Paper text:
At high pH, TWIK1 adopts an open conformation. The high pH structure shows an unobstructed path from the intracellular to extracellular solutions through the channel cavity, selectivity filter, and bifurcated extracellular tunnels under the helical cap. At high pH, the selectivity filter adopts a nearly four-fold symmetric conformation with K+ ions bound at five positions in sites S0-S4, as observed in other conductive K+ channels and the previously reported TWIK1 crystal structure at pH 8 (Cα r.m.s.d. within pore helices and selectivity filters = 0.6 Å). At high pH, the residues immediately after the selectivity filter, H122 and D230, project back behind the filter and away from the conduction axis. At high pH, a wide-open path ~3 Å in radius leads from the extracellular solution to the selectivity filter above H122 and D230 and below CH2s. The constriction in the lateral membrane opening at high pH is slightly smaller than the cross-section of an acyl-chain methylene (12.6 Å) and, consistently, similar acyl chain density is not observed in the TWIK cavity at high pH. The TWIK1 lateral membrane opening at high pH is larger than that observed in other conductive K2P structures, including TRAAK and TASK2, and just small enough to prevent lipid acyl chain access to the cavity. While the conformation we observe at high pH is likely predominant under these conditions, we cannot exclude the existence of a subpopulation of particles with a slightly larger opening containing cavity bound acyl chains. The high pH reconstruction is more anisotropic due to preferred orientations of particles. Some regions, particularly the intracellular termini and TM2–TM3 linker, are less well resolved in the high pH map, but amino acids G24 to F280 could still be confidently modeled.
Author numbering:
A (entry chain A), B (entry chain B): 24 to 280
The structure:
Amino acid sequence: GFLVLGYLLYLVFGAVVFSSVELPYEDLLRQELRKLKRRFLEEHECLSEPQLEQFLGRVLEASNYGVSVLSNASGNWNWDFTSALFFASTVLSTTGYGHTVPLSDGGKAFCIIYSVIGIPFTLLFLTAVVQRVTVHVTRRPVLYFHIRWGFSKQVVAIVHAVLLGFVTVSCFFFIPAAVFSVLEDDWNFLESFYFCFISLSTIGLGDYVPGEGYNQKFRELYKIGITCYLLLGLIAMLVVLETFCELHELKKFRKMF
Amino acid sequence: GFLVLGYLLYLVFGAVVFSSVELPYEDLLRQELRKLKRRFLEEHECLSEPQLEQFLGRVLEASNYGVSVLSNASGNWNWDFTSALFFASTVLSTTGYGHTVPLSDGGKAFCIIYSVIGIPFTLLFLTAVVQRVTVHVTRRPVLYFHIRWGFSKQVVAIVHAVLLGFVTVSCFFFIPAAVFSVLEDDWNFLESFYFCFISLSTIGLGDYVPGEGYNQKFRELYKIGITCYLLLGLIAMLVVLETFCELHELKKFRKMF
Ligand SMILES: CCCCCCCC
Ligand SMILES: CCCCCCCC
Ligand SMILES: [K+]
Ligand SMILES: [K+]
Ligand SMILES: [K+]
Ligand SMILES: [K+]
Ligand SMILES: [K+]
């Protein structure tokens, strides 16, 4: 009741603030992309608006569908054992970057069937893998702290679980942000941090995707390393979110609302 | 151990089957989109490959970033109270269609901050709303069945919870698939079912997004109706997935693996 109105109010607060900050930039880019439309068309006097409209209709449909028209088309194979292993990790993990999606009626039908049983199986996989890590990285330090210093078990967990999140946050955001800032030359640090947040959070917006380097040296090892990092981030934030959910303070908030 | 290998094996099985079915179609489309590249370039002899490569570099970057270059650019406002309410519902619900994402350094920074506290708050919202529905749609019929027929409570829940999923599945897939097949003229039934599965599942691939009708009559009421349907689907599949997780058979599978 009260929360539902608050949630609706919260999106309303979200929509105005984005309208206050994002929309002027978007109006600027939409004004400058429309400027780009008219520069590109002005440059190519031969080229006309309607045929181009149809061409981009297909090109962007495909792009939405995954088949980037970039790299002379002979760029990276959207569907190859490694890339398909990446698509399947993302669709099973719900990230759904959108850089690769099924292109056929039959292909879509298998993806549904594959994802009806695949995703529950993958939730089982991530939950089991997450459960192991909680015993090690988070539970073990808490036990050591209480025994050495001897204060109450109830107070050590709540106060110090918060401390253990910072360790995970730095390990999986800041250091990886620097790593990604080194491997991807065309990224800054802010975009890399944004990509790491969206990927681990599972939003998978798809504006930042790794492995797009033009005929880069280690495409296969790199696609599998990024796959392993993306699961690792998912496991480590399901551990952090499990611990925050376990926290008495956050738990009370849930009970209240 | 055994599961982790199986999960890795499962993606390997996934990658080969997609390579067996999707890749020939993708090779066909990538062969025919490269054909489209060379038809479009062949038609426009004036137009040259490199400048076009740069132009599409920006156009598809923006498209990834959300600003579709379609509808003379003056199409729908990516960021307006309704559309922003939709972006915020999707990013909070993790769907992340990618049709709208932050375009600025400052905008990204707020989206992170907005989504650090927004998403946990939204998980709280969906969980609370889901919890209410379970008491009504699923729990009430089970109680009625046992009293009227008098068989054991343990056996009624497990056998008939499966029955209640079909009701939810038809209510939120088949009938909505027909509804979407009516509102979106350019869709078939299969694509609509695919869109409903990905959206409710939260994959949010973004190849199917509603509200793209060119200056359609009811853009605001329609964007908010689709928003309400997408939450409703999320609530009804978190109820179905809660009940399947509750099921003794599925629970045993989790315990086993
Ligand atoms: C503790 C098990 C880790 C498994 C990682 C798998 C990465 C592909
Ligand atoms: C039972 C509460 C339903 C609220 C739906 C809100 C849709 C925007
Ligand atoms: K997603
Ligand atoms: K996406
Ligand atoms: K996308
Ligand atoms: K998701
Ligand atoms: K997504």
